[PDB]
Design a protein around this ligand. Structure first.
Ligand SMILES: NC(=[NH2+])c1ccc2nc(C(=O)c3nc4ccc(C(N)=[NH2+])cc4[nH]3)[nH]c2c1
Ligand SMILES: [Ca+2]
Ligand SMILES: [Mg+2]
Ligand SMILES: [Zn+2]
Ligand SMILES: [Zn+2]
Length: 223
């Protein structure tokens, strides 16, 4: 997250850290047995860590569970990153409490103007590399599709939306990947891509989760 702040320990209780020996992507808990992340975060052998804040220290409120299965969206295009979403089932169900809770899926799509919260343990420098150990947060509004498509001509589809600041300075970044974008209590986006991080006129591009609720719901009920 570049230009964001420290959330506070367990203040974003639906945030997850995907680990394959190290933290490589984030995810959101949707219920005791399922997580949603990005498809470009697909790897084999993933452990889902919940109640995390500092990912390098065991502070006591964590739950480390391995995944039993990963389902990448059937229409995911790794080249355009269109339909960049993946579901992860846990081997055991997480025990939900104040530090580990699930986030709700949207009933409709959010409007441009809406402020959301984006969180993750990804890079924090635009020019440089700094990886934090605690969760970083960023409040950012949904941008008009017009400004999104001008910045990325011919790259944006109806399953993507941009959020951020065109001036630059503030954006999600590598490592935040798969992470949540919550607007008004609903998970509206997943960190998908952008051009570098926090660059002027290069806002982040997020998977428009409101277009996948039927797919998510149908898949977790049948798996
Ligand atoms: N396991 C891998 N091979 C992997 C995993 C995540 C990655 N993430 C990037 C990346 O390159 C990347 N993830 C981004 C997320 C947000 C923004 C943004 N500017 N908003 C830019 C990003 N760039 N490469 C990745 C490679
Ligand atoms: Ca920890
Ligand atoms: Mg994240
Ligand atoms: Zn990424
Ligand atoms: Zn990149």
């Amino acid at each position: 997250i570049v230009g964001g702040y420290t959330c506070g320990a367990n203040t974003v209780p639906y945030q997850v850290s995907l680990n394959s020996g190290y933290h490589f992507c984030g995810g959101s808990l949707i219920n005791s047995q399922w997580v949603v992340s990005a498809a470009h975060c697909y790897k084999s052998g993933i452990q889902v860590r919940l109640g995390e804040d500092n990912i390098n220290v065991v502070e006591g409120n964590e739950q480390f569970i391995s995944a039993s299965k990963s389902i990448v969206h059937p229409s995911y295009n790794s080249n355009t990153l269109n339909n960049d979403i993946m579901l992860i089932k846990l081997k055991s169900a997480a025990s939900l409490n104040s530090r580990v809770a699930s986030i709700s899926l949207p009933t409709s799509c959010a409007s441009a103007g809406t402020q959301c919260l984006i969180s993750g343990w990804g890079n924090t420098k635009s020019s440089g590399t700094s990886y934090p150990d605690v969760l970083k947060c960023l409040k950012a509004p949904i941008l008009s599709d017009s400004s999104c498509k001008s910045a990325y001509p011919g790259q944006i589809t109806s399953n993507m939306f941009c959020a951020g600041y065109l001036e630059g300075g503030k954006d999600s970044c590598q490592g935040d990947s798969g992470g949540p974008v919550v607007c008004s209590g609903k998970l509206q986006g997943i960190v998908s891509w952008g051009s570098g991080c926090a660059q002027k006129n290069k806002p982040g591009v997020y998977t428009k989760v409101c277009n996948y609720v039927s797919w998510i719901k149908q898949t977790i009920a049948s798996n």
